[PDB]
Each structure stands twice: as structure tokens, then as C-alpha cells.
């Protein structure tokens, strides 16, 4: 068998070829990765300074992060290298987190302004899509924080008039101001599509108790306003008595801002929360 040796030599050569190819491919995956990290550190930002502009720069850094995730997933072999990991948390995981900070604080700020909420819907949509792509959980922990902020501000503005219920119609208006801002935020959230099907709103609402942003909004402000109202009413003090003596005005100012109950409207149910808060009048 001087016919087995060539068969053996050939087999061996196939192995050598495959080993060179793997070494080559892996090494190039690494190379491309590094060139990207180089290109990453070559894009500075402008933090918490929305000069417009500074956002256009942020989108490019975000896109770079998209590429990074692609390159690592294209060769999964890339991840288990103790010098690719060492820059993964020394350069990209920080650059990532600085970008995250930039996006979430710019989105939160642009949402709590109520104006920008209607004035720049196109700007905010860009922030939503962007933040979700980078790190979806952070978009939610940002929407979490925003929602929680609006409930806090409105719940506070309602309770402030308990000691002056003459002005209750005005407070009850400011609550609808935010209510509307939330109506238009969830729109908006759904307008931003995801893989295959669904949207960002449905996906947020799925990983939360909540059914709509409005529903959790009213429910929560209704509590910390109910608690205040009733605490004040149960305390037999003068404001607690002015609560009772002005009882119709309240129920009156309510319908004059909501519409009152079952048949017509649409603001029913969302109306029903504000009614329950104010229910010791019995």
C-alpha cells in the first residue's frame, strides 16, 4: 500500500487546510471587531445637551453598537476570548452605558415637558426606537420612570387643593393635561414596530401588570389622592368639613371635566377612578 500513504497525506492536508481557515476566520473576526472599537472611541459625544446635532452624533454611536452585537453573533466563537471580553467591559460596556444615560435622560426630559410631547412627536419616536434597539429593558425602566413621574406630579397637584377645594376644577384640569400626554405617548409607543409582529406598547404592557398607560396612571394617582382626601375628611378638622360642605361642587366640577358615566363619553371608566377617590361624601 503505497496507495494508503497518499490517501493518508491527503486526509491530513484537509485537516491542516481547515485549521488554517478557522484560525484565519477567527483572527479576522477579531480584527474587524477591533477596527470597530477604534472607530467607536473616535466618536465623542455631547452629554445632556440636546443641541440637536448632539443627537445626530448619538445615533451614529448607537448604530456602531448594533454592528458590534452583529459581529459577535456572526462568530459566537468571538465572545470566549479573554482579550475581547477585556475590552467588551473596558471600552464598550462603558461607552454603552454613557450612551444609555444620554438617551434615557433625553427621552425622560422630552416627555415630562408636555409641550415637546405634542410639538416634537417625530423626535420622541426616534428616541423610543433608538433606546429599545440598544437595550430594551432600559427603554422600559425609562418609561417606568417617566410614567411614575407624571402620576407623582398630578397626584400632588390634586391634593394641594384639598385645603382649598374651591380651586378643584383647576387641579382636575391639570390632571387631564397629563392624562392627555399619556394618551399621546402610548400611541407613539405602538407606532414603533418590532420583529415580525407587535409593537413597543404591547410589549411593555405584557411585561407589566398594566393594561394601558392611562389605566395605571389614573389608578395610581387615584390612590395617593384618595388616601389624602379621606385622611383629611376623617380628621374632623375644618378642611375635612369644607370637604363635606362643598360636596356638590366637587361632584359638579368632576362631571364638567369628564362627562359622567355609562352611555356616551369614552372618558367613562377613566372617570370612574376619580369618582372612587372622592367617595366618603356618603
Amino acid at each position: 500500500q503505497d496507495i494508503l500513504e497518499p490517501f493518508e497525506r491527503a486526509l491530513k492536508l484537509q485537516t491542516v487546510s481547515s485549521k488554517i481557515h478557522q484560525t484565519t476566520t477567527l483572527l479576522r473576526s477579531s480584527l474587524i471587531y477591533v477596527h470597530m472599537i477604534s472607530q467607536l472611541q473616535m466618536m465623542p459625544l455631547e452629554t445632556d445637551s440636546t443641541d440637536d446635532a448632539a443627537l445626530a452624533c448619538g445615533l451614529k454611536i448607537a448604530a456602531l453598537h448594533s454592528q458590534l452585537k452583529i459581529n459577535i453573533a456572526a462568530n459566537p466563537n468571538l465572545a470566549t476570548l479573554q482579550l475581547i471580553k477585556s475590552c467588551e467591559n473596558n471600552v464598550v460596556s462603558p461607552n454603552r452605558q454613557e450612551l444609555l444615560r444620554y438617551l434615557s435622560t433625553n427621552l425622560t426630559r422630552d416627555c415630562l415637558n408636555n409641550l415637546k410631547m405634542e410639538n416634537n412627536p417625530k423626535r420622541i419616536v426616534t428616541l423610543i426606537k433608538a433606546l429599545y434597539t440598544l437595550s430594551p429593558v432600559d427603554l422600559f425602566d425609562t418609561i417606568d420612570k417617566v410614567l411614575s413621574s407624571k402620576i407623582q406630579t398630578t397626584a400632588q397637584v390634586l391634593s394641594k387643593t384639598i385645603t382649598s377645594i374651591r380651586n378643584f376644577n383647576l387641579s382636575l384640569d391639570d390632571a387631564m393635561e397629563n392624562r392627555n400626554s399619556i394618551l399621546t405617548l402610548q400611541n407613539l409607543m405602538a407606532a414603533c414596530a418590532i420583529e415580525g409582529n407587535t409593537n413597543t406598547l404591547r410589549n411593555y404592557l405584557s411585561q407589566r401588570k398594566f393594561s394601558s398607560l392611562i389605566d395605571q396612571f389614573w389608578s395610581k394617582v387615584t390612590n395617593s389622592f384618595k388616601r389624602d382626601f379621606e385622611m383629611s375628611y376623617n380628621r374632623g378638622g375644618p378642611v375635612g368639613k369644607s370637604l363635606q360642605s362643598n360636596s356638590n361642587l366637587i361632584y359638579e366640577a368632576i362631571s364638567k371635566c369628564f362627562g359622567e358615566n355609562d352611555p356616551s363619553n369614552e372618558l367613562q371608566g377613566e372617570l370612574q377612578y376619580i369618582l372612587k377617590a372622592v367617595s366618603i361624601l356618603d
Binding site: 491542516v16 487546510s17 481557515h21 484560525t23 477567527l26 483572527l27 480584527l31 477596527h35 470566549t80 476570548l81
Partner: protein, 67 residues
Amino acid sequence: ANDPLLDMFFDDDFVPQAFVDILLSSFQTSQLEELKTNCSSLLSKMDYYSGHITKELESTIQVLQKP
């Protein structure tokens, strides 16, 4: 004796994931431009070897045809 780089590849226990791992560690931060130009050249040489081996392969398989 031949060149280490090529002989390395003829080693059964040579594992590609392992080799690149030890290599890149020399080390990162700033001086990753340094090691970036080193890998370029090292790649070129691997590239030469790749085609050499392919040529040797082609030539070997031909002899399998009735000698």
C-alpha cells in the same frame, strides 16, 4: 525543520480557538493599534500558507488517480 507557523498547523492537538486567544493577549488598551498591525501581517502569512496547502492538496489528490 520548516517554519514554526506552518508546522504549528500540522499538529493534531493544534486548536484554532486556543491559538488566537493566547495571541491577542499582549494586551489591549491603546496598544491595540500595535497588535492590530501585527495581526495584519501574521494574517498575510497564514494566507500564503493557506494557498500553499491547497496547492499541495490538489497535487496529492491527483496521485490517488491510478499510480
